[PDB]
Amino acid sequence: GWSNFKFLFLSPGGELYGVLNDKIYKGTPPTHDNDNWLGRAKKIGDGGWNQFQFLFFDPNGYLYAVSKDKLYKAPPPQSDTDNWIARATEIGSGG
Amino acid sequence: GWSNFKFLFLSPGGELYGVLNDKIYKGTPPTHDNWLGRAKKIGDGGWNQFQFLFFDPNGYLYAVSKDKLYKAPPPQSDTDNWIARATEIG
Amino acid sequence: GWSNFKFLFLSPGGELYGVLNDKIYKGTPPTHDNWLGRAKKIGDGGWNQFQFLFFDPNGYLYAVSKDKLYKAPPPQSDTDNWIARATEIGS
Amino acid sequence: GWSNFKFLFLSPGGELYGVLNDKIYKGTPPTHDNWLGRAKKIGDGGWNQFQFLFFDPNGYLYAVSKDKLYKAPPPQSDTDNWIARATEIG
Amino acid sequence: GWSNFKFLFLSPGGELYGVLNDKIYKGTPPTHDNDNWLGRAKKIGDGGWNQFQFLFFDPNGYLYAVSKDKLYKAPPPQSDTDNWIARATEI
Ligand SMILES: CC(=O)N[C@H]1C(=O)O[C@H](CO)[C@@H](O)[C@@H]1O
Ligand SMILES: CC(=O)N[C@H]1C(=O)O[C@H](CO)[C@@H](O)[C@@H]1O
Ligand SMILES: CC(=O)N[C@H]1C(=O)O[C@H](CO)[C@@H](O)[C@@H]1O
Ligand SMILES: CC(=O)N[C@H]1C(=O)O[C@H](CO)[C@@H](O)[C@@H]1O
């Protein structure tokens, strides 16, 4: 169901991140063909991830994200209940 | 111009890779300079089929096509049938 | 609008690349209070001499001190001595 | 307010910058209106310390403070000011 | 000379503007050390320019003036007989 992901990208701590149906997941990349990645991935965000147009890491752990006019930089979401967009530092336009 | 690309991303060895009109190219990033003109074509078709394309820091290339995920060292040259030999990890 | 770009990504070297329409741009990633500085100190000493200090549309800097007008490109670092290479115009 | 501002200038991108009691605000030039009440406050504290505060054509903000000279992106840059400080390698 | 001006700034087009003693003047920037800028400068206002605390251009050549809590916008004056203050928009 990899073609159904909106984002699929990598942290510098080796975790694979993926945005699927407005949720975001993470986990080490699969190694074999029979590995079921979704089934061992941690869900670290439950709604609102599809709004984004770019979403990537720098090598220092920071997660960049573009939502329409705006660029955010912050450490990645840590759980389900971590409202990332609410605490992410806007560095984007002149907000 | 640059917008005709479907993918355009950097490898950790410092090389920019660009999917254009079904072919893939690589060459060092531009700084001032016609990139596409001095760029090595390293694939000759099949490259639009991908939804994602990305390097890990070890120099492995990741690719998603038709609900399948692939991993291997990047296409070496236009004679290299990458998708035929890349490892399905889906 | 950061969305206008079709491509937005980083270099191992720490630079931000953005493709916008047909062109590509290479620049410093934007940053998170304290302007102010830091950053960035472009000259040290001699600067409150001046009554006016302003730019050419071409990026040449003008300054007025003691009834004389001075012109030169701006210093790129605080080691660069400006007035010293600034030529005076107005007789 | 107008006569209470220390500084009142425009960026190469057409935004009006105002420094008032140690705070700097930006926002679209008036055309009429309550410019202050509806501006974005982009800095707080020490803004009155400068003797000069002005742009270069390329969107760098210059500042004179305590006999020294300073240069940086304005506080709270936007995308257009980024593109202008950027090297176009298109 | 220069230190007697209250305002001395550049239009987006490259012309130098200066307020000297309630009067305002314009002309291409001094080209050399010998050049007497005021001598050839075109007088573009003959009264009422000491009143301003700020006097500046935007990118499109509009001129702004601040005077007792009123801001004034309009294309710049062009001569002795151009009543700028009265045709300016009174923000
Ligand atoms: C884009 C974003 O930050 N989404 C988060 C959010 O809005 O708060 C939720 C908790 O209420 C999280 O589950 C979501 O991950
Ligand atoms: C997606 C992919 O692997 N494309 C390759 C392919 O189809 O085989 C060709 C050589 O036979 C290469 O030129 C292509 O680059
Ligand atoms: C007015 C002027 O140009 N002052 C410069 C100066 O005196 O030399 C120094 C470089 O050594 C610089 O720090 C100062 O900016
Ligand atoms: C501030 C201002 O606009 N002053 C003008 C004015 O009031 O009328 C005069 C001619 O009528 C001009 O010479 C002045 O420049």
Q: Which residues pair with E63 in a beta bridge?
A: E57, E74
Ligand 4 centre and the CA of E16: distance in Å? 19
Any ligand 2 atom below 6 A from CB of B77: no
Place of tokens 């950790």: B12
Per-residue burial over E49-59, b = 16 or more CB atoms within 10 Å of its CB, e = otherwise = beebbbbbbbe
Distance (Å, whole) CA B66 – CA C38: 50
Phi and psi of E44, rounded to 5°?
-125, 5
Closest C-alpha among E29, E26, E6, E34 to residue E76: E26
Phi and psi of C70, rounded to 5°?
-120, 145
Distance (Å, whole) CA A15 – CA A37: 11
Instruction: Identify the nearest ligand to the CA of A85 by its number.
Output: 1
CB atoms within 10 A of CB C9: 17
Q: Which residues of chain D make contact with A93, given a CB cutoff of 8 A?
A: 78-79
Q: How many residues does chain D have?
A: 90
Nearest CA in chain D to A93: D78
Rounded to 5°, angle at Cα D74 from D69 and D75: 115
Given a contact cutoff of 8 angstroms between Cβ atoms, the answer to whether A92 and A76 are in contact is no
Ligand 3 centre and the CA of C80: distance in Å? 7
Q: What is the CATH number of domain C1-34?
A: 2.20.25.510
Any ligand 3 atom below 6 A from CB of C77: no
Q: Does domain A1-95 correspond to CATH entry 2.20.25.650? A: yes
Specify the CATH number for E1-91; select among 1.10.490.10, 3.40.50.970, 1.20.58.220, 2.20.25.650: 2.20.25.650
- Write the DSSP string, B70-81: EEESPP-STT--
- Where in chain C do CATH 2.20.25.510 domains reside? 1-34
Distance (Å, whole) CA B5 – CA B17: 10
Which CATH fold topology does D1-90 show? Answer: N-terminal domain of TfIIb (2.20.25)
Supply A2's token pair.
């990899």
Per-residue 3-state assignment (H helix, E strand, C coil) for A70-86: EEEEECCCCCCCCCHHH
Distance (Å, whole) CA A7 – CA A17: 8
Rounded to 5°, angle at Cα D70 from D69 and D72: 160
CA atoms within 13 A on the CB side of C48: 6
CA atoms within 13 A on the CB side of A32: 2
Place of tokens 């935004």: D15
Q: B42 CB contacts (<8 Å, ≥6 apart)?
A: B24, B25, B26, B74, B75, B76, B77, B78, B80
Q: C22 CB contacts (<8 Å, ≥6 apart)?
A: B1, B2, B3, D90
Q: A81 CB contacts (<8 Å, ≥6 apart)?
A: none
Q: Which resolution in angstroms does this entry have?
A: 2.5
Strands B23-27 and B52-55, sheet pairing: unpaired
Distance (Å, whole) CA C12 – CA C5: 20
Which is the closest atom of ligand 1 to the Cα of A80? 13
Measured in angstroms, the CA of C46 and the nearest CA of chain D are apart by 6
Taking CA atoms only, the protein residue closest to ligand 3 atom 6 is C81
The amino acid sitting at B71 is K
**CA Rg, chain B, in Å?**
13
Distance (Å, whole) CA A59 – CA A64: 11
Q: Inter-chain contact A68–C29, Cβ cutoff 8 Å?
A: no
Residues 16-75 of A with CB under 8 A from C: 53-54, 56, 58-59, 64, 66, 68-71, 73
Distance (Å, whole) CA A75 – CA A78: 9
Q: Which residues pair with E55 in a beta bridge?
A: E65
Helix boundaries (H) for chain B:
82-85
What is the count of residue pairs from B and C with beta carbons less than 8 Å apart?
35
Nearest CA in chain E to D12: E59
Distance (Å, whole) CA B57 – CA B10: 11
Within 6 A (CB) of ligand 1 lie A 45-49, 77, 80-81, 83-85
Distance (Å, whole) CA A92 – CA C5: 13
Nearest CA in chain A to D73: A94
